[PDB]
């Protein structure tokens, strides 16, 4: 797992993309790079021990959606360090850093059934106060939970469901 080795590269790519106001192009370029890693034949090539500067070039060849200097350069550096497999995570941490910079959040809402779309409005309005970020909602439906709602905002959850209340009462006794 590349959660830790991807942080420097995601940070550098984001700081560079900001200086040039190309954050959207950088994000799309990374999303294409992380897909080139998943192809069945390319994943074979990334494992076998090729010299970094020929692996990097054969990787650059399969991508013409990377801007001439700066995407190609990122690929060359990661290839030199042998970390091209980390791209799928560089992308995630880039999206995360972007969401932090533009002050945005995406909170999950899990319910026994769809909400009234006034409830959703009040939920978004309340969370945009709990969090300084403008919040997207993507309501989800689960029926093990049976009443109330779960609000999950990253690693913060508000267990409003009645299922939670039941499991929390049973263990009081």
């Amino acid at each position: 797992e590349f959660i830790t080795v991807a942080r420097p590269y995601a940070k550098a790519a984001f700081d560079f993309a900001v200086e040039h106001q190309s954050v959207e192009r950088w994000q799309d370029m990374l999303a294409f790079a992380a897909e080139v890693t998943k192809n069945e034949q390319m994943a074979e090539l990334l494992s076998g021990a090729l010299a970094p500067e020929t692996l990097a070039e054969s990787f650059i060849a399969v991508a013409g959606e990377q801007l001439d200097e700066n995407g190609q350069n990122l690929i060359r550096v990661m290839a030199e360090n042998g970390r091209l497999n980390a791209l799928p995570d560089v992308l995630e941490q880039f999206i995360h850093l972007r969401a932090v910079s533009e002050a945005t959040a995406e909170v999950d809402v899990i319910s026994a059934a769809a909400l009234s779309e006034q409830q959703l409005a009040k939920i978004s309005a309340a969370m945009e106060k709990r969090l300084s970020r403008k919040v997207k909602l993507n309501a989800k439906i689960d029926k093990s939970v049976m009443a109330g709602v779960i609000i999950r905002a990253g690693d913060m959850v508000i267990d409003g469901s009645v299922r939670g209340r039941l499991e929390r009462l049973a263990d009081v006794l």
């Binding site: 021990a49 090729l50 010299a51 020929t54």
Partner: protein, 107 residues
């Protein structure tokens, strides 16, 4: 022509990298100009792509990274036969008794 480059130097162990076609075989002897003096390396391992780990047959001091290396395409080979009688030689077969060239016929 010299086709390889030093990439590490850690004590007596030297790493060299060649194009992935012309990698020296194990126990092949390399040669590099450690300043105004020649130095030969014995390939100990082929590891990874293009890179080769070697043991220096002399003082490792003075080596830079990026020095050109030439791959002698034969193991360390020494003079043999009647011409080596009465002479002192080092591991590489060179005279260290100051009486001059050996006069070998066969290595």
């Amino acid at each position: 022509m010299a086709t390889g480059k030093i990439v590490q130097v850690i004590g007596a162990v030297v790493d060299v990298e060649f194009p992935q076609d012309a990698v020296p075989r194990v126990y092949d002897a390399l040669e590099v100009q450690n300043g105004n003096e020649r130095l030969v390396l014995e390939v100990q391992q082929q590891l990874g792509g293009g890179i080769v780990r070697t043991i220096a047959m002399g003082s490792s001091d003075g080596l830079r990274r990026g020095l050109d290396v030439k791959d002698l395409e034969h193991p360390i080979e020494v003079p043999v036969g009647k011409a080596t009688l009465g002479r002192i030689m080092n591991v590489l077969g060179e005279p260290v008794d100051m009486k001059g060239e050996i006069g070998e016929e066969e290595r």
